Design a protein around this nucleic acid. Structure first.
Lengths: 55, 88, 100, 271, 51
RNA sequence: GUUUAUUAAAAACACAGCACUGUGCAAACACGAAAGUGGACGUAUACGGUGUGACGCCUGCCCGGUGCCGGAAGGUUAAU
RNA sequence: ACUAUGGUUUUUAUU
RNA sequence: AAGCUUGAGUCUCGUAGAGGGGGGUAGAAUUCCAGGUGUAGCGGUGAAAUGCGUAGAGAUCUGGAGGAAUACCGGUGGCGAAGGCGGCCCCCUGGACGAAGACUGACGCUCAGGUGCGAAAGCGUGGGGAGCAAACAGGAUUAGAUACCCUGGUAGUCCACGCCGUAAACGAUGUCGACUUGGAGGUUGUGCCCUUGAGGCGUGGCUUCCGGAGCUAACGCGUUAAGUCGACCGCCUGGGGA
């Protein structure tokens, strides 16, 4: 909930296709995942992370 | 809701001592200033029922206070209406 | 009043007209009695996808305290100007000033 | 505004009327009032060809300024007015230099307010700022696409053209006809919407109002004698055939076109 | 059980069959045995992934 | 309101309304060997044509046929 | 989770 | 006609939320249109057929058009008086809670009549039409069918603005007041952890399952009660008829 500009942490939760990795296969908690998705959405709108590989 | 500016403008008028937050007069004046902060958030379209019910809730609490003040002291009610915005 | 970071993507060749924009961005908040805390630089940065035949954009960041009853009427300044895309005000989130 | 009344007396049932207290109650500015003279509606033989044509009372026109070019000269709105030919309305404007002119009415602007002209003007209705400076989604008012032709596009109450795609020197206009017209931004473009947007509130009412309109009712072909309509009869009440015009021709399902010479100007066809 | 596969793996996890009902039911749920072993000893069991 | 001027004045003619169908504006339409003329400084709730008649409450079954449009290959078939 | 059919529809019995 | 306080309220700094109302802005899969590349199958089942192609469907590539809910996270989880409420982003907002001071001084409760408010469909003028779908053209089905099943599909769900006030509107528990008895989870503050820590051990709010007193014919209700009675309202006295 605190940051969206330093992308070093956000690249740890998305693939080389830019798709979000499930909490059930990263040892991460879902109440984190729900807001890591918000940090990724913030960084997509910043144009520093990809939305979709179409594109 | 009522702003920090609009709250202080009531507490520094409807008082008789230094920072006197309880008097029944200031309780009624704050509820009447909360209706001034309601402007721009009430009466735009028929789709909202919340802010008319909020107005009616503040008005219900303002009646509960006034109905007691004009029974216990009498004169403090007929004097308050000369310095607060009521009926006209 | 509330804190806003205000981030917007500028065309990287307009970096010499940005000081002339900052001149009237400052006037549009100091005329509203708000306060600024950075408004200098966040650098020219590479995007995750190309736009307008390029791959970089310029970032300024404002980091301000503003009256939130006019913060959307202030957003028109970036929206009429062709040098800018996807402007967003970005509220609080532990802002760069904190009443010290 | 609109006003309406419930039944009160015999034949005076429920009624509706449209009213405007901001419309000028006086007379048109006489130097700019012109007779709108008509040749008479006669064809090449000296006779009338259009059936049941008529109206209005005089149709004299208030000129309106469609050839102006001004920069840095401000102006003030003096009136809201009507012209007997159209639904667009007109506004009397005074330039601060100065001259009195009728402008094709912009919406979101009243009498006693000030506008500018050209490049140093704000993005507000009636300010006539260059169409090459404004973003897509801007409402451009009345256009003019052939330089010096006059007030092309957006000519009815509450109408507007909107700019939807720029291509460097060029811009595409979204038309009320469904079209996607392109131009090099050299348009008159007054900025905003046309008129007052209340002409749709009208009701006309009683059949005696058709005389002021100058329009006589269409008649049923079955209600004629056989020599003055093809459907004319005949106590069997039936034609035995597909329906026709008074000239004896079929039109149902029969699509008609003659234009073959705008194929490069046509872009989009309405759904 | 039964229940159709939705994630492809060639080797089983022993997660859904006989571990899982026979045994797995009515022997640990709500205060059965308790003392510390079915809850508090597991709260003291360290895990390098949630859990 | 219009109606058999001198045997027939109504239950016919038609309006906001319902629907079909021609029209994106150099419109469709009517007239025109030709200049053009009106539609029209109007611009799709605006314009042309025909059914039905406001309002209130509803809108059976049938495309075999005649007409009309779509599908466009083929056939017969004139100028060539 | 491991392979389709849909209708008829007792009267006296009990003294 | 005044006083008090453990009822009920005031002001300052903090805690959580798909609650409501309005603007800014992306995705996924489905559906049509144009021209290419151009081929024989493409569609649907419990079964079968209508559909769809030889006048060249389906599919695929680059464009154009376009609608509805926002899928994963989403929970033995929040929030709303309820009916209900999930992409990001920005304002405004009724309640609930942590916590140190200072101020009211019984200001509290219920409610006939009245008045506020839709999951749904119905009234209706103009826009919209991809999911799904009463109506409806057909395929059938079968002894028959108007149905189950299947191709297509209107009202309607969607939008602006108003009427209707519906339901199992079931949380089976009227609105208010003060009590009673243990355990365990979730969710949110707070004190302290050199945080085994999707936290731990106490303490405030909410809430779910198990369970004790009491109450019940039975289910069980079980401190948020079907318990204990105290305020006020609505309503009742064999079944059908109604």
């Amino acid at each position: 909930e605190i940051d969206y500009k330093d992308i070093a942490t956000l690249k740890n939760y998305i693939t080389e296709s830019g798709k979000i990795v499930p909490s059930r296969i990263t040892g991460t908690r879902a109440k984190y995942q729900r807001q890591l998705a918000r940090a990724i959405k913030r960084a997509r709108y910043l144009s520093l992370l990809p939305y979709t590989d179409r594109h | 809701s009522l702003s920090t500016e609009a709250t202080a403008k009531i507490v520094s008028e409807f008082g008789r001592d230094a920072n006197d937050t309880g008097s029944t007069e200031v309780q009624v004046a704050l509820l009447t200033a909360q209706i001034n902060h309601l402007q721009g958030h009430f009466a735009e379209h028929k789709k909202d029922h919340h802010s008319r019910r909020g107005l009616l809730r503040m008005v219900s609490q303002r009646r509960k206070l006034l109905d007691y003040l004009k029974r216990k002291d009498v004169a403090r009610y007929t004097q308050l209406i000369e310095r607060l915005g009521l009926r006209r | 009043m509330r804190h806003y970071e205000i981030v917007f993507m500028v065309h990287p060749d307009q970096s010499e007209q940005v000081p002339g924009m900052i001149e009237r961005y400052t006037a549009a908040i100091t005329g509203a009695e708000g306060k600024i805390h950075r408004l200098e630089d966040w650098g020219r940065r590479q995007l995750a996808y190309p736009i307008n035949k390029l791959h970089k954009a310029h970032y300024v960041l404002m980091n301000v305290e503003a009256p939130q009853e006019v913060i959307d009427e202030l957003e028109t300044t970036f929206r009429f100007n062709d040098a800018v895309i996807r402007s967003m005000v970005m509220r609080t989130k532990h802002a760069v000033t904190e009443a010290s | 505004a609109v006003v309406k009344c419930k039944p009160t007396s015999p034949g005076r049932r429920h009624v509706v009327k449209v009213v405007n207290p901001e419309l000028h109650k006086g007379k048109p500015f006489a130097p700019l009032l012109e007779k709108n003279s008509k040749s008479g509606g006669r064809n090449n033989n000296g006779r009338i060809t259009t059936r049941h044509i008529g109206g209005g009372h005089k149709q004299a026109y208030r000129i309106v300024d469609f050839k102006r070019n001004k920069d840095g000269i401000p102006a003030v709105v003096e009136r809201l007015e009507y012209d007997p030919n159209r639904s667009a309305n007109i506004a009397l404007v005074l330039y601060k230099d100065g001259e009195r002119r009728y402008i094709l009415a912009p919406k979101g602007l009243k009498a006693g307010d000030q506008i500018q002209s050209g490049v140093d003007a704000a993005i507000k209705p009636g300010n006539t700022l260059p169409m090459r400076n404004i973003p897509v989604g801007s409402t451009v008012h009345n256009v003019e696409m052939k330089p010096g032709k006059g007030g092309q596009l957006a000519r009815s109450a509450g109408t507007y053209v909107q700019i939807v795609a720029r291509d460097g020197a060029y811009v595409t206009l979204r038309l009320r006809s469904g079209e996607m017209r392109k131009v090099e931004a050299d348009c008159r473009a007054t900025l905003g919407e046309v008129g007052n947007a209340e002409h749709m509130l009208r009701v006309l009412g009683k059949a005696g109002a058709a005389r002021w309109r100058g329009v006589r009712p269409t008649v049923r072909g079955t209600a004629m004698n056989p020599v003055d309509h093809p459907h004319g009869g005949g106590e069997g009440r039936n034609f035995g055939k597909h329906p026709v015009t008074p000239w004896g021709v079929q039109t149902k399902g029969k699509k008609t076109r003659s234009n073959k010479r705008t194929d490069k100007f046509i872009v989009r066809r309405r759904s | 059980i039964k229940v159709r596969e939705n994630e492809p793996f060639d080797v089983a996890l022993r997660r859904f069959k006989r571990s899982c009902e026979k045994a797995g039911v009515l022997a640990e749920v709500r205060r059965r045995e308790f003392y510390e072993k079915p809850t508090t000893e597991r709260k003291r069991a360290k895990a390098s992934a949630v859990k």
